[PDB]
Amino acid sequence: RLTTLNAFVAQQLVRSESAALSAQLAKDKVNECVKAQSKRSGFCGQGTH
Amino acid sequence: KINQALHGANLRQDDSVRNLFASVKSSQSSPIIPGFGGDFNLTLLEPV
Numbered sequence: 001r002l003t004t005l006n007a008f009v010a011q012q013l014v015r016s017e018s019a020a021l022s023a024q025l026a027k028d029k030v031n032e033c034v035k036a037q038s039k040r041s042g043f044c045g046q047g048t049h
Numbered sequence: 050k051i052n053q054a055l056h057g058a059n060l061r062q063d064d065s066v067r068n069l070f071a072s073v074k075s076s077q078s079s080p081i082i083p084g085f086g087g088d089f090n091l092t093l094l095e096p097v
């Protein structure tokens with residue numbers, strides 16, 4: 001049980017840092033190609049966004 | 050369970066690779082011709 005919970009804490013740390021990096025990426029979209037018409041074709045909108 | 054998990058991982062990584070194949074595909078392009086670039090010796094880039 002304690003080994004299972006240790007692995008659970010490990011994957012929770014994994015998903016926590018993944019969610020943190022994903023939040024950084026998400027604010028990168030909302031500051032990059034959402035509030036502005038950037039030239040990131042296919043990065044967030046496919047074709048000429 | 051780990052077999053269907055790795056099957057799922059393989060299928061989604063194949064999904065990602067043909068997303069980037071759709072990304073790299075142009076709407077229009079030109080066929081590559083030998084002697085391209087004029088004097089530019091790009092023959093290593095030539096796919097023959």
Ligand SMILES: *[C@@H]1O[C@H](CO)[C@@H](O[C@@H]2O[C@H](CO)[C@@H](O[C@@H]3O[C@H](CO)[C@@H](O)[C@H](O)[C@@H]3O)[C@H](O)[C@H]2NC(C)=O)[C@H](O)[C@H]1NC(C)=O
Pocket residue numbers: 090091092093
């Ligand atoms: C553009 O670059 C390529 C590669 O850098 C050149 O490829 C050349 O291809 C010829 C044909 O096989 C090679 O010639 C050989 O030369 C040896 C002596 O060097 C000779 O004994 C062989 O019978 C054969 O003729 C040549 O080595 C090769 N060059 C290199 C650097 O690999 C190509 O010629 C270049 N084109 C232009 C317009 O500069």
